[PDB]
């Protein structure tokens, strides 16, 4: 259940207001609140991710001026929720007395204004990693067949690596990549894609957590990216063998299965089980074979 005392509505609502602003700062709620209403970890969970996100975003090639229109945004949308009269104000007219002024349905309301917010602001940086995705193709001159109609496997190769060190610090961009090719349909594009995907997960280093984090995101979406497509799934079931090889590099204990397939489905955007069968079962049984 979920207590909040009258006084401790207003810090929660100032809380909130204070993790619109341009610091992003964490909520920082008292334990014993908490405690009277878990329901708020969520909530600031919630704000936490999204201000990370946006923290996520300067980092990248983005021009500053649009991670300026989205922190307003944010900020606008955050201030609504703080303007809200159903969670904050005091009952009024045909309200007194309604069911809604307890506080536990004060809360959920809160949360679910949240939830809503953080879908929001996912819809327009997904949007955003579509388009640097794009701008990173076209400033490689690889956005389609006619552009790399002309180059040798030489130059088609060292392209294609460029293209995935650009590609695989930041696996939004990546799949923002991905999607740009599906909606392009250009096959030949898409097809010399796959093959330098592939041989960038084939010979990548490994030393550092950042670069197998870069790598596992890539190859888990890899595999997601066949799922309920016929060309791509045709792709993989002839590069087979060399995936197996791939993925027991990045997941090699083949005993530890079920830490593996957590690890896989969080870094996961299908829901197939697809890659976990991949990566925790084919692989593993195959190499066992002989
Ligand atoms: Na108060």
């Known amino acids: 259940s979920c207590t909040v005392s009258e006084e401790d509505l207003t810090t929660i609502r100032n809380a909130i207001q204070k993790a619109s602003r341009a610091s992003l700062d964490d909520v920082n709620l008292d334990e014993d609140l908490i405690a009277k209403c878990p329901l708020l970890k969520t909530i600031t969970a919630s704000l936490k991710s999204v201000a990370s996100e946006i923290a996520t975003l300067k ?13 307003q945004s944010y900020e606008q949308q955050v201030n609504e929720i703080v303007k809200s009269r159903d969670i904050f104000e005091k009952q009024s007219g045909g309200d007194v007395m309604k069911e809604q002024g307890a506080m536990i349905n004060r809360m959920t309301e809160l ?79 898409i097809d010399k894609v796959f093959d330098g995907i592939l041989k960038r997960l084939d010979e990548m280093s490994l030393e ?30 002839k590069k087979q063998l060399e995936l197996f090889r791939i993925a027991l590099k990045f997941y090699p204990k083949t005993g530890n299965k079920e830490a593996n397939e957590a690890d896989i489905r969080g870094r996961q955007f299908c829901d197939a089980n697809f890659p976990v069968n991949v990566i925790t079962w084919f692989a593993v049984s195959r190499a066992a074979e002989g």
């Open 59 to 71: 980092d990248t090639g983005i021009s500053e001026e649009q991670v300026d229109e989205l922190k």
């Open 111 to 189: 949360q679910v204004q949240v939830a809503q917010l953080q879908q929001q602001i996912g819809e327009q940086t997904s949007r955003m990693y579509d388009d640097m995705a794009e701008l990173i193709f076209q400033r490689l001159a690889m956005n389609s067949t006619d552009s790399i109609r002309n180059y040798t496997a030489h130059m088609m190769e060292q392209k294609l690596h460029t293209l995935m060190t650009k590609l695989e610090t930041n696996y939004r961009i990546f799949l923002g990549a991905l999607r740009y090719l599906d909606h392009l349909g250009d096959q030949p594009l």
């Open 208 to 237: 550092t957590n950042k670069e197998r984090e870069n790598g596992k995101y890539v190859l888990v979406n890899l595999l997601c990216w066949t799922v309920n497509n016929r060309f791509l799934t045709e792709k993989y079931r």
